[PDB]
Design a binder for this molecule. Sequence first.
Ligand SMILES: Nc1ncnc2c1ncn2[C@@H]1O[C@H](COP(=O)(O)OP(=O)(O)OP(=O)(O)O)[C@@H](O)[C@H]1O
Ligand SMILES: Nc1ncnc2c1ncn2[C@@H]1O[C@H](COP(=O)(O)OP(=O)(O)OP(=O)(O)O)[C@@H](O)[C@H]1O
Ligand SMILES: Nc1ncnc2c1ncn2[C@@H]1O[C@H](COP(=O)(O)OP(=O)(O)OP(=O)(O)O)[C@@H](O)[C@H]1O
Lengths: 506, 529, 509
Amino acid sequence: GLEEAVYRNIQACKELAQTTRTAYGPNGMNKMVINHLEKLFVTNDAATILRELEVQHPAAKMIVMASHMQEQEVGDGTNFVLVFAGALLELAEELLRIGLSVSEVIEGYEIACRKAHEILPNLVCCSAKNLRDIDEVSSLLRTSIMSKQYGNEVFLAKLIAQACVSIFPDSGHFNVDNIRVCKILGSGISSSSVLHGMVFKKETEGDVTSVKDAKIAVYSCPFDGMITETKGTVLIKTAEELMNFSKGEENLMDAQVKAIADTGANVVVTGGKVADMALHYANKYNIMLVRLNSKWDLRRLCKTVGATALPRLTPPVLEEMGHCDSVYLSEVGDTQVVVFKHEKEDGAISTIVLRGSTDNLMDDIERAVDDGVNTFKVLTRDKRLVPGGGATEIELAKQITSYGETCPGLEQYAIKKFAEAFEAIPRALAENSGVKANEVISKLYAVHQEGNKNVGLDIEAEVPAVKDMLEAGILDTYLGKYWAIKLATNAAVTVLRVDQIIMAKP
Amino acid sequence: LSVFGDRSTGETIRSQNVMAAASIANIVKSSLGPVGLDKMLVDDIGDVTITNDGATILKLLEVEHPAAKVLCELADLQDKEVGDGTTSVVIIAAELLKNADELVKQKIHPTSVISGYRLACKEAVRYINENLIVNTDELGRDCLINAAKTSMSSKIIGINGDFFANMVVDAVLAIKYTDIRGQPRYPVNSVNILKAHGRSQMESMLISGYALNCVVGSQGMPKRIVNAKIACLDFSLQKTKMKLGVQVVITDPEKLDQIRQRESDITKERIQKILATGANVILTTGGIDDMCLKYFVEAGAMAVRRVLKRDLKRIAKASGATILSTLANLEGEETFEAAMLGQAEEVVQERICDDELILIKNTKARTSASIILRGANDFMCDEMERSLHDALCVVKRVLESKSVVPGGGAVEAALSIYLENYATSMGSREQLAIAEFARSLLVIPNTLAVNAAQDSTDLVAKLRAFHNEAQVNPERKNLKWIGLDLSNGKPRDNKQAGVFEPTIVKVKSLKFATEAAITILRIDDLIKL
Amino acid sequence: SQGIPQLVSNISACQVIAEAVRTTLGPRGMDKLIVDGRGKATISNDGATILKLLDVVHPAAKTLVDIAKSQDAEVGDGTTSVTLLAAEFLKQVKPYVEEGLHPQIIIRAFRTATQLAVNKIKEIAVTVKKADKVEQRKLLEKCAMTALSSKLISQQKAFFAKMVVDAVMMLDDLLQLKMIGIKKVQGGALEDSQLVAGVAFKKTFSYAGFEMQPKKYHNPKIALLNVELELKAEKDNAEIRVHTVEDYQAIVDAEWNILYDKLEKIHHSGAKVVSSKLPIGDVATQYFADRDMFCAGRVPEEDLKRTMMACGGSIQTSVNALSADVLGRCQVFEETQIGGERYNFFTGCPKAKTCTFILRGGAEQFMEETERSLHDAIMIVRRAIKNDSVVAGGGAIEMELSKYLRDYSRTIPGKQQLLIGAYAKALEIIPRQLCDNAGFDATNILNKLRARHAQGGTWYGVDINNEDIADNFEAFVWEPAMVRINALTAASEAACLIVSVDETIKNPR
Ligand SMILES: Nc1ncnc2c1ncn2[C@@H]1O[C@H](COP(=O)(O)OP(=O)(O)OP(=O)(O)O)[C@@H](O)[C@H]1O
Ligand SMILES: Nc1ncnc2c1ncn2[C@@H]1O[C@H](COP(=O)(O)OP(=O)(O)OP(=O)(O)O)[C@@H](O)[C@H]1O
Ligand SMILES: Nc1ncnc2c1ncn2[C@@H]1O[C@H](COP(=O)(O)OP(=O)(O)OP(=O)(O)O)[C@@H](O)[C@H]1O
């Protein structure tokens, strides 16, 4: 009942690498994933794969828990962890079959990890010029939106560029929470735009198109028949007693909307449905009524202006209301939306509205937009850029093998295997593009031998050659490559450190 | 029903006949081409023979199936017709059956497939014969020198390709003789390739004549002779015997002595009749007596002893002389004057290192020569001799048959475009028969691309992209006669590379493969007893 | 399963969706019987009707359903054209998958061959507006004639061709299929099919009220109700049980004043005619005959749904809410005797965008065969006035694209040659299935059609009437170019969503 007992901890992580190796790159394949609520979904993002695939082996859960740390401090390269650290554990199995101990590979990996953190600042070619221009920003964002939505990057690189420039004067406060995404059904991606302030997809149900009131109250309860918090035994016998309750319901709701006018609040948000007679009372006292059925659309407004959602039927409470500058309506893309604009304030809220005919298609654009904001959320720190497309993966594999050859002793075996694990990432890019991977690696090492740096893969099915990444405009993030190498090495050293797994009762 | 076996009919015998025939094509799929892979031929005894030649594969392949037994006989119709081509018939006809098997499932009767294949075959010979090349360009214009240089690249001789390709080009054009009504062919016998140690491989010389690897022995006899008479004989001038197994009886001791004095006296009589003819070139297989060599250094006859028998058959064919087996003419002893003698011009004993050779010049009818492969050791000389023999047969088999065709995938790629446009001109339930005939011819570059370690979807499609432009517009910017260089993995022109194939190996391959695909497609019922 | 065999499991689930709508291609296609869980049978030849009722459980098969779900909402039909075209794109590249070709190379050549299909169609599409100096009324009479050809009304096909071109003229620029109604009543000859400019119903109201109720009205107030005005009604009754014998007179009188006060609110609103889904009793038709009011009950709700849109009113269940805000208006209100039955209809509405076409005949199969051809003939003459740049139907544009994508494939080296060359044979499913669904010989027609396209035939297609080939551009069988573009781009996009999928992830639930 025991065969190897050290190989089964690695084979569980090799299956986790295979679910994202073919899904790597701009030529990567999509995944037909099934939601837990029985919903069909088509995506190719690496973070949405692990969220739905409930992996159960705890040896492969270390790389998944490393992906949750990969989502922190950087929003770039979750697929880089599942490919590179998967190639670390696959190449480490060739050393253990010879007779090498597992503790010798551990100290040899941490030696080559600190050596790879010194060669990576030497490969920084360009940097951002901090001009806050749409030509400088969209030139670097065109590589990050690639490998998410290929072919439609010409419309996505300009829209997120117009959102992040409006936040860059607010220095030290740029984040992904300031740029929100609201999806509106429409024609396609060509009709999409970008707006300022908080934009919701639902229009104002009332007849007010513009109001300058600051007091905003949110009530999650729908507009229906009022129920007393006490017992409240209400009995009806005849038709005249039913009309006394029907007219008395409208008369009490007339005093309910009058309490909103007494506190000086002309903006009300209702989570549930609104009755037709209660909608007439809101338009009488010039009150803007916006219906928001989504709970995440209601929770977004409490964390911005402070207006809380109360369960009671319109309570006149002055303490739990929010504050905004100007709430109005705007007609963009043949659809009226509500804008929570900040006129007196300088403003740091931007909303990118996305249009599309398929909800399964518009959700993949939302993961491509939030990964585009997270590329420049990293660039609020020290600006360093590295060439992409497998350009840095060969030069880092060239210097480590040159370093491990000159170093004598038993530690030269784990350093040489640390460089060949970087070769799997151009092997993942060449295989997904329909090109023989053994020819591109030989074409990459032949041009890097002569000193022609910044050379990556030519993205073409018919051309197995290479091209320059500096003239092509392909650039990655150095901090995106810095935390990816450190977290994948710390994850792959954790799986090799654990030998056997024993179940225990609580 | 009570019969003497099992009966099976319908389309299930059509699908079983094409699966048994295409499985034989997989036996000769990887072995196609000059880079073909070896395959193990397991015998019933237990030993195995490693052969890569496809003609020897189908001879030893024994599959007890009647569908596979049909493809066994076409190997006998291929060597008896031309002598080459064999496995190219098998891959074409099996892919012809596999595409026709898809037509049976597509509600097409095979009668339209059989009549459509014969019209597709006859139009294939018409498009080939309209795009041929006459056997010419022997001197002055290269598609030759470069033709034999590709065959010479696999060995160590390919470092200096231009030096050794000139030795085989002028040797092929030297052995040309019509001999029947203006045929000219090339014989199975060729130049004799000798070797020596001439301190490097660059000291090879193109000798315009046969060179004998024998040493004349004595030095007092002169090595330069002017007379033309050449004598060849097989009987020994040494002491003769009756038989190796039958002997004569000798009883008296003095009787033994007088037959040795008679042997010394009858050697004086035979040398009087040989030198009376004036023949100085004396070549003897059985050896020359020691006192008989004394008479040759004073008369000036160039006597060579211990000559090989197979070397003397090319010498007597050179000067037109007759080989004399016995000197006794059934009652006495004569030399057969003016019968066993030829004519020549000059025989020089050239000083070659480690083997002083005998060269003959301007004989009666020889047309042969010799190449002295001077080198450094026996390793580089033995590998260069088989490289000259392999480069000789490449230029020989091309320049025989009276016209040639640029082959190596250039024939079938051009036929895949013309026969498709011809298929759209006929109709009448045979368009799909000719359109699948064009796609079935594409397996010849398809198996050649997978054996050349290249992408088969790119290398075959690069052949059809160039051959389509020859049919669209007749402008010279269209690449014409584009062959397939399997070494570099890039298509080139066959006229510049010199890759040529005979027409009779290309015509009879398309003729035999369609007649073999017709016979298997006509099988609709199986009867066993 | 990731790689090659996951694509084979998705390429076999594509066949079971195409086979459900393979035989329904063409007007003479075979019908399908789909039975739900309740036990009702549904016979339809429409491809959108079958795919809505299948509800397939396979995840790779749900992609081709949702593409046809987007097609019926925008274009209107042609769900079997985008299904067989997207299916045949996969069956040609299926032997290329096992060879080792990457599925991204299938994507890169599908985006190229689709863009060549758009440029070839727009260069070959001819705008037919006033060709050969003909009237536009005669052009729709010829194109609707081929839709009714080889049918049961071929004896009077010239009369039925004039009926479709008159119904499309009475509407505005906003043309739709659901605005036209088709009624099926039994009796009469075949040539007695009249036309109604507005909404008409069968009018099964056979209660009392004769020698009154004038059928002529200039501007009446159309009342739309759902109330019952019967004496033995289920909602208007009174049952009071007592011993008092003078109260016995009161319970019969107060039961009458319940119906009388509900009838008094009708005349107080000023409604000239009243309509109701529930039947109307004889004492309510007697009350309207005394006050000179028209009444006609027992009308269907679907006939009322086309009436409230045209008259400009709305349906109100109760009689208390009857006022001038919900009363409809019209200009012509007459009464006919078509087929011996009474027929009420309105003509000259301010929102007159709906009509009704009554059919006559001696057999019900002579009527249901026509209404399948009538709805197709309506959408043909709707597409003719909408899109002027049209091409020949019947597989004529598919055989021309198979010629253009074949010789261009031989000019492109690489992996795109053997794929786009297979893309040309994948477009042959439209003229091939037109022969097998019509019962012809698919071998002799397609071999004659491809031989005609090489000699110069650019508008020849498959004739569904005869077993011949004919120029469908000259035979007035047309299809718009923009629908053929939208059917080709949706077929390659649906074929892309099956090829690009490489692994299926199922959450454990
Ligand atoms: N078109 C391209 N040209 C050059 N390099 C590319 C291209 N596309 C991807 N890459 C390379 O792929 C790696 C990042 O690719 P990718 O966009 O798949 O990661 P990611 O999807 O952003 O990660 P995450 O899953 O966290 O979003 C980089 O090393 C980059 O060099
Ligand atoms: N010089 C050349 N360059 C490129 N291809 C060549 C050349 N010579 C031959 N070929 C290819 O090699 C193939 C010949 O294969 P091979 O010699 O292994 O068997 P074969 O001769 O076809 O069998 P058989 O003797 O029955 O005909 C031909 O199809 C031809 O296309
Ligand atoms: N009279 C005809 N002759 C030949 N082919 C026809 C004829 N009518 C229709 N077709 C074929 O039927 C196909 C259209 O099928 P179908 O009628 O189900 O869709 P549609 O109603 O035209 O589309 P839509 O839903 O956009 O109106 C076309 O591709 C055409 O080739």
